[PDB]
Amino acid sequence: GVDIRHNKDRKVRRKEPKSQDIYLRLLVKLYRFLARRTNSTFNQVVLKRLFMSRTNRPPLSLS
Amino acid sequence: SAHLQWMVVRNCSSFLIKRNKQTYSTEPNNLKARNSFRYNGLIHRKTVGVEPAADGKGVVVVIKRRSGQRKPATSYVRTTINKNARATLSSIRHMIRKNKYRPDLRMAAIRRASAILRSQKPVMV
Amino acid sequence: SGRLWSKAIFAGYKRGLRNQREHTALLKIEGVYARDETEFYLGKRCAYVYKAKNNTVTPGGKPNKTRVIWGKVTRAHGNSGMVRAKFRSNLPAKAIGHRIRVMLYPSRI
Amino acid sequence: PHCSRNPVLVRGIGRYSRSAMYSRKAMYKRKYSAAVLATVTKPVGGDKNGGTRVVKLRKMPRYYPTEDVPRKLLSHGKKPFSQHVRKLRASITPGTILIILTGRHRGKRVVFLKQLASGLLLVTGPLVLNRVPLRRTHQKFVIATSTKIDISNVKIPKHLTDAYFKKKKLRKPRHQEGEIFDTEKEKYEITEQRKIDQKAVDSQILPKIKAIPQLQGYLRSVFALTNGIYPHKLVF
Amino acid sequence: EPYIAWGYPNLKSVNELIYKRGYGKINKKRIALTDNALIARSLGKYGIICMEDLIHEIYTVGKRFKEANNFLWPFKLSSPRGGMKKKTTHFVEGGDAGNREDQINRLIRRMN
Amino acid sequence: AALRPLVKPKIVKKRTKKFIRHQSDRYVKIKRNWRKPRGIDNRVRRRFKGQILMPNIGYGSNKKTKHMLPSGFRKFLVHNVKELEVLLMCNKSYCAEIAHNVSSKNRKAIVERAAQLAIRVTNPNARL
RNA sequence: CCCGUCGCCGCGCUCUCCCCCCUCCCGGCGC
RNA sequence: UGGGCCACUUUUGGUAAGCAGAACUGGCGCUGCGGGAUGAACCGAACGCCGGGUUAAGGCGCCCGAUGCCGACGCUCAUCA
RNA sequence: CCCCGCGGACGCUACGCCGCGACGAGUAGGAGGGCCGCUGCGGUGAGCCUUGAAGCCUAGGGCGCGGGCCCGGGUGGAGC
Ligand SMILES: [Mg+2]
Ligand SMILES: [Mg+2]
Ligand SMILES: [Mg+2]
Ligand SMILES: [Mg+2]
Ligand SMILES: [Mg+2]
Ligand SMILES: [Mg+2]
Ligand SMILES: [Mg+2]
Ligand SMILES: [Mg+2]
Ligand SMILES: [Mg+2]
Ligand SMILES: [Mg+2]
Ligand SMILES: [Mg+2]
Ligand SMILES: [Mg+2]
Ligand SMILES: [Mg+2]
Ligand SMILES: [Mg+2]
Ligand SMILES: [Mg+2]
Ligand SMILES: [Mg+2]
Ligand SMILES: [Mg+2]
Ligand SMILES: [Mg+2]
Numbered sequence: 020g021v022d023i024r025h026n027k028d029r030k031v032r033r034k035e036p037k038s039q040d041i042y043l044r045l046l047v048k049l050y051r052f053l054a055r056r057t058n059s060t061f062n063q064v065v066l067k068r069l070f071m072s073r074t075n076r077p078p079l080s081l082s
Numbered sequence: 083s084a085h086l087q088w089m090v091v092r093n094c095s096s097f098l099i100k101r102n103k104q105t106y107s108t109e110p111n112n113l114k115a116r117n118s119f120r121y122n123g124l125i126h127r128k129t130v131g132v133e134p135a136a137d138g139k140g141v142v143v144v145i146k147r148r149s150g151q152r153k154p155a156t157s158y159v160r161t162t163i164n165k166n167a168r169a170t171l172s173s174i175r176h177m178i179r180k181n182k183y184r185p186d187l188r189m190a191a192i193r194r195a196s197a198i199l200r201s202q203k204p205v206m207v
Numbered sequence: 208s209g210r211l212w213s214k215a216i217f218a219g220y221k222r223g224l225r226n227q228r229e230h231t232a233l234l235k236i237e238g239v240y241a242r243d244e245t246e247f248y249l250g251k252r253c254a255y256v257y258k259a260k261n262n263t264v265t266p267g268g269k270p271n272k273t274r275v276i277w278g279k280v281t282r283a284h285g286n287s288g289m290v291r292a293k294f295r296s297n298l299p300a301k302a303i304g305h306r307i308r309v310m311l312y313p314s315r316i
Numbered sequence: 317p318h319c320s321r322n323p324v325l326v327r328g329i330g331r332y333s334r335s336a337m338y339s340r341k342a343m344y345k346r347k348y349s350a351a352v353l354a355t356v357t358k359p360v361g362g363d364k365n366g367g368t369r370v371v372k373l374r375k376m377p378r379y380y381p382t383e384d385v386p387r388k389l390l391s392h393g394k395k396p397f398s399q400h401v402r403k404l405r406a407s408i409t410p411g412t413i414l415i416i417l418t419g420r421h422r423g424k425r426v427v428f429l430k431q432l433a434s435g436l437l438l439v440t441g442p443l444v445l446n447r448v449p450l451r452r453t454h455q456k457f458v459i460a461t462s463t464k465i466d467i468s469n470v471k472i473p474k475h476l477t478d479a480y481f482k483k484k485k486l487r488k489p490r491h492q493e494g495e496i497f498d499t500e501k502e503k504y505e506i507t508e509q510r511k512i513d514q515k516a517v518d519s520q521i522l523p524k525i526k527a528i529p530q531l532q533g534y535l536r537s538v539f540a541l542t543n544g545i546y547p548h549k550l551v552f
Numbered sequence: 553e554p555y556i557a558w559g560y561p562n563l564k565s566v567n568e569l570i571y572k573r574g575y576g577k578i579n580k581k582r583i584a585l586t587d588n589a590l591i592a593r594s595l596g597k598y599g600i601i602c603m604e605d606l607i608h609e610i611y612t613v614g615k616r617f618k619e620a621n622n623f624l625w626p627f628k629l630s631s632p633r634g635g636m637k638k639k640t641t642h643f644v645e646g647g648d649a650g651n652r653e654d655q656i657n658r659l660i661r662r663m664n
Numbered sequence: 665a666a667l668r669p670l671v672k673p674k675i676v677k678k679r680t681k682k683f684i685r686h687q688s689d690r691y692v693k694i695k696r697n698w699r700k701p702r703g704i705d706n707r708v709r710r711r712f713k714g715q716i717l718m719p720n721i722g723y724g725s726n727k728k729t730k731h732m733l734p735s736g737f738r739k740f741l742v743h744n745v746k747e748l749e750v751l752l753m754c755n756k757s758y759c760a761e762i763a764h765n766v767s768s769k770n771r772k773a774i775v776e777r778a779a780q781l782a783i784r785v786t787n788p789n790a791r792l
Numbered sequence: 793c794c795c796g797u798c799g800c801c802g803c804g805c806u807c808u809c810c811c812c813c814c815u816c817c818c819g820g821c822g823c
Numbered sequence: 824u825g826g827g828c829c830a831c832u833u834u835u836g837g838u839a840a841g842c843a844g845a846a847c848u849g850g851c852g853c854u855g856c857g858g859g860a861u862g863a864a865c866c867g868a869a870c871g872c873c874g875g876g877u878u879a880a881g882g883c884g885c886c887c888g889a890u891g892c893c894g895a896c897g898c899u900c901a902u903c904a
Numbered sequence: 905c906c907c908c909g910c911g912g913a914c915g916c917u918a919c920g921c922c923g924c925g926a927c928g929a930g931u932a933g934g935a936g937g938g939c940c941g942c943u944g945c946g947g948u949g950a951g952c953c954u955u956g957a958a959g960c961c962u963a964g965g966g967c968g969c970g971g972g973c974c975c976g977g978g979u980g981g982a983g984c
Contacts, residue, residue, distance in 0.1 A: 021926095023927080028927080044089060044919090045089065051918080052918095088917095092917065092919080093919080094948095095948090096949075097949095098917095098948095098949095099949080101740060102739060102939070102967085103738075103939065103967095104738075104740060104939090106750040107917090108750060113753065115750040115752065115753055118917055118920085121917095167379055168377075168378040171378065171380070172376065175910095175911085180910085186915095193380045193381075193753070194753060196379045196380040197752055197753060197755065200782070201781050205779065205780060208423065209423050209540020210540055210541040213546060213547055222888050224882095225713075225887095227888090233888080238548070239546070240891055241891080241892095245548075246548075247547060248548065284888080285888080286891080286892075287890080287891045311547060312457065313456045314417065314458065316460070317805070318804095318806085319805085320803095320804055328802075329803095330802095330803065337803095341805090342808075352908085357908080370908070372908080374794075382753050382754065382755040383755070384913055384914070385670065385671060385913095386914065387796080387913085390796070390798055391797095392798085578925095579924090579925085580925080581925040581926080583924085587801095630876080630877060630878085631879080633878080634877090635878070635879090636878075636879080639867080639880075640866085662877095678872050678969085683969080697971075698970060710930095711854085711856090712855070713855080719970050719971095720872085720928095721872090722871030722928085722969075723871085723872055723969040723970090724871095724968090724969050733967075739975085743949090743951060744952080746949095746951090747951090762975085763975085765953060765956090765957070765984075766952070766953090767953065767954095768955045769955045770952085770955080786965085786966085786975070787965090787975055787976065789976095790975080790976065790977095
């Protein structure tokens with residue numbers, strides 16, 4: 020046996036939206052391809068934000 | 083749109099058969115009869131499919147036209163091919179490859195045409 | 208017209224004291240009582256030949272009651288003869304203390 | 317078409333290095349810088365049907381199975397059995413006396429002739445002596461006794477290959493449902509040819525056996541183990 | 553001390569360890585050192601771009617020993633063939649633990 | 665004779681005997697169906713030697729041969745001729761079998777249809 | 793396009809010419 | 824969850840305790856496996872289902888796998904060894 | 905500006921498929937998955953059934969790590 024702590028093995032993060040919105044699923048598909056097949060880190064940030072919950076996407080005031 | 087309509091019927095459809103560790107789709111123009119975006123016979127702007135002839139001999143290949151995508155009465159054209167096994171296979175190959183009409187179902191259509199054709203051939207003793 | 212096989216005997220399976228591994232068996236070959244003497248047999252095919260009630264088919268002969276479980280010698284087991292062997296199916300425990308044949312099959316001599 | 321020009325000292329290693337072989341092959345002076353049919357045309361077969369029929373060979377399949385299997389990856393080894401290397405035991409040398417261990421001639425002592433191209437040993441019992449004809453045997457299922465006869469200056473006929481010794485068959489011509497049984501060929505026929513080759517080999521091997529005393533009696537006997545001796549102690 | 557046995561490996565011991573059980577830590581994975589391009593890819597910036605360079609940086613402890621050593625996955629050796637004659641006492645008292653200076657090489661031959 | 669599968673790999677089962685519930689032999693009220701023993705002093709739960717084995721994920725069958733029938737095929741339950749048609753294009757890895765409720769006269773038509781479609785039926789003679 | 797005998801690695805021969813030693817359908821053969 | 828218990832070492836009360844109370848680390852509890860014949864805690868080692876090889880601690884008269892080595896040098900006779 | 909030819913496997917339910925590396929004890933307890941199971945409702949299967957539903961019995965054939973499930977034979981007689 021090898022000594023290691025297995026409590027931190029599973030990283031807790033969104034891998035997909037918890038919503039069943041098919042329109043959010045569709046552009047998640049679109050931005051999953053872009054992040055994978057481009058070196059842009061902008062698409063990576065946008066893709067991970069599409070996964071995020073509503074409280075983690077607060078409304079942006081116009082001002 | 084095919085991708086939008088797919089997300090509606092990918093798990094909730096009348097043609098969906100979910101059984102022991104398998105899934106199938108029973109819509110008319112689904113070659114290989116599998117629940118898939120590629121092979122779904124309803125959501126696509128153009129679709130191809132082959133069926134056994136109304137009689138005991140021949141293969142009917144049905145091609146979806148583009149003008150009446152909303153009108154289902156005239157949305158499909160069907161032709162009956164009743165020649166030898168090699169001739170029909172080449173004819174349906176030309177009907178896909180040369181027209182550039184969905185050239186990803188070419189071998190799915192030829193394989194299905196072969197399975198239908200030998201099903202029509204009589205059983206030997 | 209001759210015995211043509213060395214007579215071993217089934218002594219038991221390879222085991223600890225409280226754990227027994229039936230997939231290999233320990234054989235006591237007559238006349239070998241040191242590890243260096245076991246090198247002759249270290250690949251020879253061994254057979255456990257027994258009889259039963261129902262006739263079974265016999266290669267090159269008419270069906271009879273004789274059956275065999277085939278195997279071969281794998282290596283030596285400890286300082287005094289005592290080959291250990293692997294059989295195509297684990298030998299029955301009824302065979303302990305009974306005859307195992309060592310066939311002089313595949314030979315390096 | 318020269319020979320290797322590089323002797324082997326150990327397999328996979330050549331005697332000479334790249335520079336040494338460069339001079340040997342003289343690639344300093346010889347340096348080189350720069351430099352069907354799918355269809356056949358048969359005739360018309362008219363008349364007024366003019367235009368010779370361009371007819372293609374290798375025609376397209378008329379049926380496709382519903383599923384195909386992917387092709388295998390490439391292996392970079394794994395030659396077929398025909399072009400394997402045949403390894404012969406160093407204790408077995410033409411003229412030695414072997415002991416058959418497995419077959420119908422279990423325990424018989426036969427004299428070993430040349431080895432065949434399939435690795436099988438071509439042994440003979442001197443058929444007059446122990447009733448073992450010209451017959452193949454496996455190197456691994458024999459015992460090499462230390463008794464030899466100098467069968468140098470013997471003429472083994474050329475047509476004594478494995479194709480010659482391969483088993484033949486008859487069944488089954490035009491018969492599929494077997495209700496009338498083939499009541500013949502249960503007697504494998506010793507062809508008149510085989511009798512002649514056996515006569516030729518033995519007549520020029522028998523006197524060489526009569527030369528050394530009681531070798532004929534030794535070959536007539538069968539090997540066996542008694543309740544005494546043990547094989548690991550015996551010298552062969 | 554009571555948990556390790558160590559010593560001073562020689563050139564042959566370093567050779568056999570790297571060649572037989574040399575696994576590299578690439579992208580946090582344990583990739584076997586089957587080709588030189590696997591080392592040149594990750595240790596190329598330090599001039600270590602093959603197996604022989606890895607042997608030389610380890611045996612002759614170089615300027616980039618830390619990078620060459622940490623690139624190597626810790627060696628997974630088998631149990632010592634022929635026993636180990638003790639496990640709980642020090643080497644100089646008949647045991648196994650502690651520092652055997654040049655006798656680690658005998659252990660390595662039996663360990664892998 | 666019968667319809668051969670596309671490929672016939674060697675099916676390897678890590679365990680053939682059934683996992684019987686602890687103490688199911690001592691009682692008739694305890695059925696063979698497996699129940700995980702949540703007892704503080706249970707020796708089966710503690711995994712003592714020589715005790716009843718507990719099923720776990722290590723016994724799982726290979727992806728390749730999972731659910732395969734002993735003859736190269738995977739089952740699919742059909743109830744009429746239309747459900748037969750869906751197996752036309754698999755035909756080499758999946759075999760139909762008729763549900764138990766299907767009547768004698770109806771399942772005759774299923775058997776005849778599968779024969780001309782080269783579809784293997786696991787129970788082709790079940791009302792005769 | 794009859795079925796990738798393929799990649800990395802290590803080799804041999806040829807697109808140069810001479811020789812030597814066993815040979816060979818051999819040509820008749822005195823071996 | 825807020826009943827704990829045990830072992831090395833340190834340590835308090837007690838004649839002492841398989842007693843009572845502390846410190847450190849480990850363990851048992853929550854843990855199966857090899858050894859100590861037997862055993863919550865000792866020694867080894869921690870565990871998916873398997874095949875081959877090798878070890879740990881411990882062993883190798885027989886039970887019982889392995890000394891059936893031509894093992895080495897001594898010591899010891901016990902009528903409760 | 906391919907071609908004597910008119911040709912060229914599978915795939916990608918993207919909630920899918922594929923690759924590589926490491927890991928696998930567990931009470932109390934927490935979480936995930938369940939094409940595990942029961943009953944009833946909305947849809948759906950041009951589903952099943954007196955040419956035999958449910959239920960039950962079974963030295964019958966199997967599948968799943970498992971919960972369990974499918975199939976054969978018997979009984980049963982109206983539903984699932
Ligand atoms: Mg854990
Ligand atoms: Mg050993
Ligand atoms: Mg300790
Ligand atoms: Mg099972
Ligand atoms: Mg019970
Ligand atoms: Mg308890
Ligand atoms: Mg309490
Ligand atoms: Mg206390
Ligand atoms: Mg714990
Ligand atoms: Mg423990
Ligand atoms: Mg124990
Ligand atoms: Mg004790
Ligand atoms: Mg093991
Ligand atoms: Mg003991
Ligand atoms: Mg013993
Ligand atoms: Mg583990
Ligand atoms: Mg666990
Ligand atoms: Mg019933």
